[PDB]
Amino acid sequence: TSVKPIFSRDLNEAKRRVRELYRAWYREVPNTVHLMQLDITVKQGRDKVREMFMKNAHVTDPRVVDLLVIKGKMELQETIKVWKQRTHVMRFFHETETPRPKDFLSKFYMGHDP
Amino acid sequence: NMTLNFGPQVLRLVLELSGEMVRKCDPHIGLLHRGTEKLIEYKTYLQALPYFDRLDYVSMMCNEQAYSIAVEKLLNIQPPPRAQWIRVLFGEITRILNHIMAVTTHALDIGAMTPFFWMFEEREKMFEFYERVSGARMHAAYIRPGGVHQDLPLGLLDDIYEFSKNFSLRIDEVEEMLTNNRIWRNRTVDIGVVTAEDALNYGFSGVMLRGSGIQWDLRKTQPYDVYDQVEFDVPIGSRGDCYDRYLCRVEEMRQSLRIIEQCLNKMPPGEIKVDDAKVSPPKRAEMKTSMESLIHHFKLYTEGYQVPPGATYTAIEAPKGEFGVYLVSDGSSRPYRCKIKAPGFAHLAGLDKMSKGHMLADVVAIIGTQDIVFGEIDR
Amino acid sequence: GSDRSRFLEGKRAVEDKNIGPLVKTIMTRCIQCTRCIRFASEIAGVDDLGTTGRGNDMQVGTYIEKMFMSELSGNVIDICPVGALTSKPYAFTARPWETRKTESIDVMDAVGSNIVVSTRTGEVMRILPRMHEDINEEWISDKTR
Amino acid sequence: KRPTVRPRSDVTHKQLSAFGEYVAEILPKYVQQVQVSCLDELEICIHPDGVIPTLTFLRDHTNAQFKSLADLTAVDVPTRQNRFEIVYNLLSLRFNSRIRVKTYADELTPIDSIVSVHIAANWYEREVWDMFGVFFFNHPDLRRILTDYGFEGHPFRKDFPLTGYVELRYDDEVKRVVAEPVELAQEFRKFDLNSPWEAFPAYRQPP
Amino acid sequence: GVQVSPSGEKITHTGQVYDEKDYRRVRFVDRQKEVNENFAIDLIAQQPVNEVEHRIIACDGGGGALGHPKVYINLDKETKTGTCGYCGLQFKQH
Amino acid sequence: LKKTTGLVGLAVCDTPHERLTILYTKTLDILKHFPKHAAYRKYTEQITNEKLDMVKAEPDVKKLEALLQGGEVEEVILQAEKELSLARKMLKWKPWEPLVEEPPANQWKWPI
Amino acid sequence: QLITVDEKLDITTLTGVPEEHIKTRKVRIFVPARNNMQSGVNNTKKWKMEFDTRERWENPLMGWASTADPLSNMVLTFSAKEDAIAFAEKNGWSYDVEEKKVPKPKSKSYGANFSWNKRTRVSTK
Amino acid sequence: ASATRVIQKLRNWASGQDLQAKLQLRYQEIAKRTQPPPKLPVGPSHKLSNNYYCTRDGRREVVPPSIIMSSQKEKKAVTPAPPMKRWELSKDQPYL
Amino acid sequence: VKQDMPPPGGYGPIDYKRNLPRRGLSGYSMFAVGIGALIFGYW
Amino acid sequence: EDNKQFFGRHRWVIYTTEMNGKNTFWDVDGSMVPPEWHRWLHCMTDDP
Amino acid sequence: TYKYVNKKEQESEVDMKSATDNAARILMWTELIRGLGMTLSYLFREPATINYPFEKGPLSPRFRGEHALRRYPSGEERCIACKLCEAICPAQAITIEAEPRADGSRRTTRYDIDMTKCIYCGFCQEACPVDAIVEGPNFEFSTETHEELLYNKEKLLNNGDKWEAEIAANIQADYLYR
Ligand code: SF4
Ligand code: SF4
Ligand code: SF4
Ligand SMILES: [Zn+2]
């Protein structure tokens, strides 16, 4: 309830910053897959971007939103001022991982997870 | 602006250049982080020392000593005189080792590679001593809380004397090559020039201070050991350049022998580990005959010796500076946090200011002065 | 206690007894606390254990090679603070600190004896009672343990 | 006197207590829980809304001259709302002394920085933000320094385990150096060591 | 001394054997299985049974130091011997 | 007389005691702005009064320094300027006021 | 300045753990009962958070015990059930409690052992 | 040392110093190995009386801190401790 | 009986010192020598 | 042995041509030193 | 007792003689020639080098290298599964699994080490109350694979039955000090 804010006061200002950040990533990705000689498509990159955004959509707190924004901005700095490399950036796609079977029977036949 | 990377030839730098001179130097630390302060909390107070040897790997014993002193300030005890003296002795030997490595790696990264090969023989001699005493070359577990592990074999003191009889001539024979060579004078002079207020602020320590006129030595002040007994004159410089720093290191190399002479000629007889068998393990003969000593052996070596809830911040004059330890403890053998403080950290924080306006091949000399070691830094 | 012994003299020892295929008896360790004696003479109504002698020569254990087997024989282990009355199966297999003591119950009977199950590198090594002041009250059965 | 015990003097436990009363009556605000340890050290707990005032005071006021920030540190205790404990270990030369400042903080409760005063913190704060999760305002450059440039989490906390979540390896199938989930070979043995029998009857806590 | 199993594998001193159906015995192919030939059990059985008069006797393990801590044994049980846990030796009463 | 100090970033100040009177008078003239029930005033007032008495009682720096027992004259001047700025800042802050907001209970409780 | 938000806190995002290791992990908040072997009571003072266990198999090479989960050996301390619950529901896990099993008080009228009419009369000494 | 007089003279003229007196190598200027079995001392704590631990507990003389200005529980200008006594030069080689 | 590796009543004195020697000759000497050789060459 | 040289070089060893069914005229390790001599060779003692 | 480096006792002079020496040292390179002379000196000296396989460096009985379990003179082992080595090994390297022995005695069935983790410290031979395990002198056991270094009970027993002709003397010399 009665608490202290961070960088903002409401979901709406949080979201305006979030939209600025989306613009940044969208306008950036090409430079990445053109500098670091990647393989994936710009469209696939933008899909990953919007997915990493949508997967935090159960949020309410402006403080949480703002911390996530800060971390995203740090990562964007890291990327555009090229420090992350092919590996650092493709570490997202789980490209060497069998999609965790959500089929209850799959889990049954394979392991012990409930 | 030709911004580029720079590595070996660990030291990952990103230079923001302008033509041939520099505009900024951003280091990229973290290439040697492991999890020291995330492991210790899952361990006792007697299988942690190795971490403090591996930290600032050159000396290792002016670090084991810091850990021991912190644990002792917590446990409200003291070690015995023979232990304190031995510990001063090896502290000075490590001052020598670290000064040697800094000097010679400086001169090597520059290109002069003969003194390196020369002094490494004497370094091998010091390692022979570490072997005769501890058992292994470098990463000895010798110095421990509650005192020390084993006494000194009956063939060491003579060797130490015979080595000190000649280290001075070797130092002079290297000075003949360097401390007057116009080439070195021009590689170092007016480089890394620093002012006292900014040094203090940035948090510099030890040599990076007393090469700028300041008078700060945590052995004259905040005396943690018998260092109040023996004489040792502190050197300082007035200009604040890599040359003055080099000369400080050499003069400390010499005053360290001025210390060792007295350590030898006054080392008393006695014990090594304080006879409080709840803290330091006992001798094996008693461990085998008596019983209570065996119980304490068992406990010490399964559950480290309990420690009361406290907190401290110690400090040492390691070759570089304020090697500090913030050791928090609950009423348990497994501690709660062991924050190291290694000067390389602030030295890097001040690199971006000592390298504003100087050329590309002076960053190396700056780093040589700073005696950058990365084990202590990454943590 | 203290940090050393002022005993430059000789010690004593005592014969060991066979008491059952469960309770390994060493008896040069009994400090003579009498926990076993009282526990037996009160809980298990056995009335076979007792002390035989006076002075250091004292011992604790039946005067003959009788067997102290009972549905509750198997708690003198947890009660004897020392390793005189050890458990033969568990013995020589492991030590406590290595273990990851999980917590569970018994099924051998319909009582509900709270239990501590000790693990080791992914395997069971021993079972212990767990204090529930109502159901099992720090005592459990030979069978379940 | 006894050989195996340091001397518990009076000079320090008195001087530093006087200085504690001094700072307390000067800053009845931005202060709480001053204390002196049984081993000649001073700790000063303060609200995070007074950090820079306290530090400026201790750096400038002649009688303190606490110039050199010998260390900045964090600690994590999860049994409270404000779980992080930020620590500054400071040193003064003229008066040849040290001091310890503490201030509580919490994830989702950032802190005011001191870079304007002690430039050493410019990097300790980066460390803190990387490892624990505590944030600092008015800081020019704040980025992962120690860990990887893609690492995610906050390890030096007490929940992020020792081994970590991911391992690395090369997989010729793609020629890169990929990160997969942790499937160790040996398990991290955790030895139960805490012995019951109470040794310190002075630091006890009744029900 | 060592014995052998159907499949030729040198039984260890503690009954470890890889049965015919186990795939973990490829590492041996083109290689060997390290084992010690001197079995402690036989090497202690061979040893003579010590004899004494003082019913109680103190054992250390050889050297004054360098052996197992001083353990004191009783020997009044004339039915059989008295062993020492650490060293395995066994005494008898006269 | 002299040629330098012994540090780096300093100067051979040839006008001592005057900058000192200036700075101390200015400190006190700012303190005038402080409520008398502020300990900062109540203390630094007398501190600077005694420093002024000392500079007026010792005209030669080579003794004024060892008498003040602080650093060297230039360090003293620097520290006085710093105290001046500290005052100008504590004037905008209201520290002498009472406490801001007490903490929870189980915060400074170590052990835990 | 301040805010009026009566929402329950959750920082599962900043934490940095995946869905699997956050959801399927049942947390247990208990007090470690005494090791009956001992008689010590400086363990039954805290409130400990542990996780459910998981696969713990044997390596084929030598025989060690491995694990797929890192958290198995993550034991956390607390001084109060309310604070432990706050931390648990904050990190988002699914907590289950084991309430306090406390001993009873008793009247040890020693002299009763040497009684006349009662049955407590022991036959030993 | 096995080397020649003329070469000694030459290397010495080159360096400037003497070397046969402060060689680095080791020609029997050490302590023989195979040293004799030694016997060791003990501390002042291996007595038989007046050694009660309660006297020298060590890690129980500790006592928790002494709080001041908690939240619930004229004068002079003071400092945290006296100032630093200024240092002096040395009697041996203060300059360089 | 007790033997724990102490030293005798005293060891010798060590050189914690700089023996960096003063070697060479005078500038007038060196220069005039070089120039005399130069002149012989020219003649 | 030659006790007129400096340290580490005052002892030395000439290996064996063939050692346990093998041709070690060129091939030469440092593990072919049996222990009861190894100890002295490494300067641990002074009596063979 | 502080000092002063890189500073003249007072202001210098402008003597033509001093300027002459300065000019000479700036032209003809006296100091550089002195450095060359020093290098010549060390050239004409004896080198500290040694032939490794035929000459091996010095040491002391307290070395710490390859490991070795041990035995009594009566053939019997010394380990009894007291597990101190496991509970003190800073690296958690060791792995033990004990059992009874058909003859009734107490002994092991698994005493495995990972010499990739063993930092070669000494704590195990400090704790072992029976001197069973003794980190030994052998430092030549480099290999070509990462499975010749996960030693086990039998490899340790072989190393003991091999090197016991040296560890006996080493310890017989070293034990008194400890
Ligand atoms: S419980 Fe154990 S110690 Fe107590 S009398 Fe019985 S055997 Fe002896
Ligand atoms: S030497 Fe140290 S690290 Fe190696 S096994 Fe022994 S105790 Fe462990
Ligand atoms: S310390 Fe020695 S006796 Fe004990 S388990 Fe380890 S090797 Fe065996
Ligand atoms: Zn025996």
Swiss-Prot record, chain B:
Binding residue positions for [4Fe-4S] cluster? C242, C248, C263
Task: Using the record's annotations, give every residue carrying the modification Symmetric dimethylarginine.
Answer: R34
Question: Where does it localize?
Answer: Mitochondrion inner membrane
UniProt GO cellular component terms: mitochondrial inner membrane; mitochondrion; respiratory chain complex I
GO BP? aerobic respiration; cellular response to oxygen levels; gliogenesis; mitochondrial electron transport, NADH to ubiquinone; mitochondrial respiratory chain complex I assembly; neural precursor cell proliferation; neurogenesis; proton motive force-driven mitochondrial ATP synthesis
Q: Please give the catalytic activity noted in the UniProt record.
A: a ubiquinone + NADH + 5 H(+)(in) = a ubiquinol + NAD(+) + 4 H(+)(out)
Q: How is it modified after translation?
A: Dimethylation at Arg-34 by NDUFAF7 takes place after NDUFS2 assembles into the complex I, leading to stabilize the early intermediate complex.
What keywords are annotated for this sequence in UniProt? 4Fe-4S, Acetylation, Electron transport, Iron, Iron-sulfur, Membrane, Metal-binding, Methylation, Mitochondrion, Mitochondrion inner membrane, NAD, Oxidoreductase, Respiratory chain, Transit peptide, Translocase, Transport, Ubiquinone
State which Enzyme Commission number(s) the record gives. Answer: 7.1.1.2
Q: Which GO terms describe its molecular function?
A: 4 iron, 4 sulfur cluster binding; metal ion binding; NAD binding; NADH dehydrogenase (ubiquinone) activity; oxygen sensor activity; quinone binding; ubiquitin protein ligase binding
Q: How is the cofactor bound?
A: Binds 1 [4Fe-4S] cluster.
Q: Which domain of life is it from?
A: Eukaryota
Q: Does the keyword Translocase apply?
A: yes
- Give membrane topology per the record: Peripheral membrane protein
Q: Which family does it belong to?
A: Belongs to the complex I 49 kDa subunit family.
In Swiss-Prot or TrEMBL terms, this protein is called: NADH dehydrogenase [ubiquinone] iron-sulfur protein 2, mitochondrial
UniProtKB/Swiss-Prot annotation, chain C:
Q: Which gene encodes it?
A: Ndufs1
Summarize where [4Fe-4S] cluster 2 binds, as residue positions.
C30, C33, C36, C80
Q: Which domain of life is it from?
A: Eukaryota
Give residue ranges for domain 4Fe-4S Mo/W bis-MGD-type: 99-145
Q: Under what name is this protein listed?
A: NADH-ubiquinone oxidoreductase 75 kDa subunit, mitochondrial
First and last residues shown, out of full length: 147 to 291 of 727
Subunit comment: Core subunit of respiratory chain NADH dehydrogenase (Complex I) which is composed of 45 different subunits. This is the largest subunit of complex I and it is a component of the iron-sulfur (IP) fragment of the enzyme. Complex I associates with ubiquinol-cytochrome reductase complex (Complex III) to form supercomplexes. In astrocytes, less complex I is assembled into supercomplexes as compared to neurons. Interacts with MDM2. Interacts with AKAP1.
Q: Its function?
A: Core subunit of the mitochondrial membrane respiratory chain NADH dehydrogenase (Complex I) which catalyzes electron transfer from NADH through the respiratory chain, using ubiquinone as an electron acceptor. Essential for catalysing the entry and efficient transfer of electrons within complex I. Plays a key role in the assembly and stability of complex I and participates in the association of complex I with ubiquinol-cytochrome reductase complex (Complex III) to form supercomplexes.
| Protein family (similarity comment) | Belongs to the complex I 75 kDa subunit family.
Places the protein is found: Mitochondrion inner membrane
Tissue expression summary = Brain. More abundant in neurons than in astrocytes (at protein level).
Curated annotation (Swiss-Prot), chain E:
Task: Write the record's keywords in alphabetical order, separated by commas.
Answer: Acetylation, Electron transport, Membrane, Mitochondrion, Mitochondrion inner membrane, Respiratory chain, Transit peptide, Transport
Residues with N6-acetyllysine modification: K70, K92
Kindly provide the name given to this protein in its UniProt entry: NADH dehydrogenase [ubiquinone] iron-sulfur protein 6, mitochondrial
State the function annotated in the UniProt record: Accessory subunit of the mitochondrial membrane respiratory chain NADH dehydrogenase (Complex I), that is believed not to be involved in catalysis. Complex I functions in the transfer of electrons from NADH to the respiratory chain. The immediate electron acceptor for the enzyme is believed to be ubiquinone.
What are the GO BP annotations of this UniProt entry? aerobic respiration; cellular senescence; circulatory system development; DNA damage response, signal transduction by p53 class mediator; fatty acid metabolic process; gene expression; kidney development; mesenchymal stem cell differentiation
Whole protein: which stretch is covered? 21 to 114 of 116
Could you name the domain of life of the organism this protein comes from? Eukaryota
What interactions and quaternary structure are annotated?
A: Mammalian complex I is composed of 45 different subunits. This is a component of the iron-sulfur (IP) fragment of the enzyme.
Where does the UniProt annotation locate this protein? Mitochondrion inner membrane
Q: Where is the signal peptide?
A: none
Keyword Transit peptide recorded:
yes
Q: Electron transport: present as a keyword of the record?
A: yes
Give the UniProt family note.
Belongs to the complex I NDUFS6 subunit family.
Q: What is its main location?
A: mitochondrion
Q: Which GO terms describe its cellular component?
A: mitochondrial inner membrane; mitochondrion; respiratory chain complex I
Specify the protein's topology with respect to the membrane.
Peripheral membrane protein
Swiss-Prot record, chain G:
Respond yes or no to whether keyword Membrane is given for this record: yes
Tell me which UniProt keywords the record has, alphabetically. Electron transport, Membrane, Mitochondrion, Mitochondrion inner membrane, Phosphoprotein, Respiratory chain, Transit peptide, Transport
Please cite one Gene Ontology biological process associated with this protein. innate immune response
**Superkingdom to which the source organism belongs:** Eukaryota
User: What Gene Ontology molecular-function terms does this entry list?
Assistant: NADH dehydrogenase (ubiquinone) activity
Q: Where in the cell is it found?
A: Mitochondrion inner membrane
Q: Name one GO cellular component term.
A: respiratory chain complex I
Null allele phenotype: Reduces the levels of assembled mitochondrial membrane respiratory chain NADH dehydrogenase (Complex I) and the rate of Complex I-driven oxygen consumption. Growth is retarded although activity and behavior are not affected during the first 4 weeks. With aging, results in increasing lethargy, rapid deterioration of motor ability, weight loss followed by death. Mitochondrial ultrastructure is normal, although large subsarcolemmal clusters of mitochondria are present in the soleus.
Give the modified residues of type Phosphoserine. Answer: S123
Q: In what way does this protein cross or attach to the membrane?
A: Peripheral membrane protein
Protein's job: Accessory subunit of the mitochondrial membrane respiratory chain NADH dehydrogenase (Complex I), that is believed not to be involved in catalysis. Complex I functions in the transfer of electrons from NADH to the respiratory chain. The immediate electron acceptor for the enzyme is believed to be ubiquinone.
UniProt lists the family membership as follows:
Belongs to the complex I NDUFS4 subunit family.
UniProt-recorded name of the protein: NADH dehydrogenase [ubiquinone] iron-sulfur protein 4, mitochondrial
Query: Gene name?
Result: Ndufs4
Covered residues, full protein: 51 to 175 of 175
